[model samples]
Target: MHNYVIIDAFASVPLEGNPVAVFFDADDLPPAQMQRIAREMNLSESTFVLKPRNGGDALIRIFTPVNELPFAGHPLLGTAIALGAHTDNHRLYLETQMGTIAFELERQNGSVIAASMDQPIPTWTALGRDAELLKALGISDSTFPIEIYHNGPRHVFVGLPSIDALSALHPDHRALSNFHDMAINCFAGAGRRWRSRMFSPAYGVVEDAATGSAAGPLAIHLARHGQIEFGQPVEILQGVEIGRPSLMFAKAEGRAEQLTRVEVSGNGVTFGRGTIVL
Candidate 1:
């Protein structure tokens, strides 16, 4: 038997945002069982924290119902927050398939307003062939100028002409599945206040309520093209079609090769914490 904990990952409250099933201290469970557990939970994503790897690093893995991911953002933050609350240590190091990473908690006004993690040093890769990917996504060149790259994994950061277009986008999953391993960040500028809609079908997520990783890379795109500035409120909206609207607050900064990083921050309210006997 093993212990499991279900956390509303990337969620501000229970049943909001993405609900992630987390299995803690489950080194005894085999990979087959873990996979079944993930499928059972059937959330957007789930995490399994394993024994420390590389001789003393927090080793972990993330999985969706269908497949496992090399890296993800909210899972890292949510897992770190859970571990911090569960542990006596003030800080902890995490080991993911990407690599070992660090996390910290910031307290303000007697509230844990933010939980942050320094992502694995981001390495940039070029955008895939626009024509090929556009067809793969079942979108024409009119969607938006297709710009793709990587922060840690392959991310195709697409910018649509308007939020209407972004919100109205409906892509063919089977065609996009051909590039499942790749990232699909389809976003657009809205006429209203600060708002953007993200579509990431490639991640098995029809629309992730909150994608800190994608938001960050997208901000970098904005800065490079002189779109937004540091301290500008970039509100990322997702999961509208699925009715799981999530608000991810992010901002852009600097330039490429000089650290044009994006910080997607939000308040992750803990819904409940319990142990699972497996």
Candidate 2:
């Protein structure tokens, strides 16, 4: 039997964000069984909490429906909130396959209200005027620049002209899937306000709400291009078009090529709990 906890990551209301499942103390389970559990949950991501072999607080393995990921946003935050209940510290550290992730817990009346994670320094790659991508997304050439940035997971970030342009984006998932295992982040709204839609069919997730990992890199990229001011909190609104509206707060601490202290914060609401007898 496995104990499971369900929570809405990056959510303000009850069911407004991405739903994730956390499986407790799953160190004994094999990879095959863990993948099976993730498939059963049928969510964007499912995390398994295990004792760390790398000397961190705990080790978490993130899994999507089709493949395992080195890192993800909602799972990391949601799992932190769920596991924070058992600890007395205000800070939580997770040992992931990618690296050790540190999170700061926000509490109200001694209860976890939200969690924030500082992502790794981003590495950016500029695309060489690829018109095919624009054609696939139905966007004009002069809309915005297309660049690939890696904070934790690799993502291709594209800036749209306006809110309506961002809303009107429809990607050819079949064609994009062959590109690589990356999320396509199409966004609008500069400065403090931001709107985005993420397509990650390459990772088996058709779309995602409140991608905390991408949010940090996006902030840093916008700041580098003089689009948004660094060191100020930027609000990224996602999942609205999918009926699961979510808000992810993020800010970067530097203005150069190497960004420092790229932090993403959001609140996760505990929705339900159950046990799987396997």
Q: Which model scores highest in lDDT?
A: 2
For candidate 1, write residues 215-238 as lDDT tens digits.
666666665566775546466776
lDDT for each of the candidates? Answer: 0.64, 0.83
lDDT of 2 by residue, 151-265 (tens): 6688888888888888877888876776576788888896689998998876666778777788888887778778778898889999888888888988889667546688998
Clashes of 1: 3
Error of 1 at 189 (Å): 2.9
Residue 240, candidate 1: C-alpha displacement in angstroms? 2.7
Best by the TM-score measure: 2
RMSD to true structure for each model, in Å: 3.7, 1.7
Backbone-clash count (model 2):
0
Off by over 4 Å in 2: none
Score candidate 1 by TM-score against the native: 0.79
**Could you tell me the C-alpha RMSD of candidate 2 in Å?**
1.7
Provide the clashing-pair count of each candidate structure.
3, 0
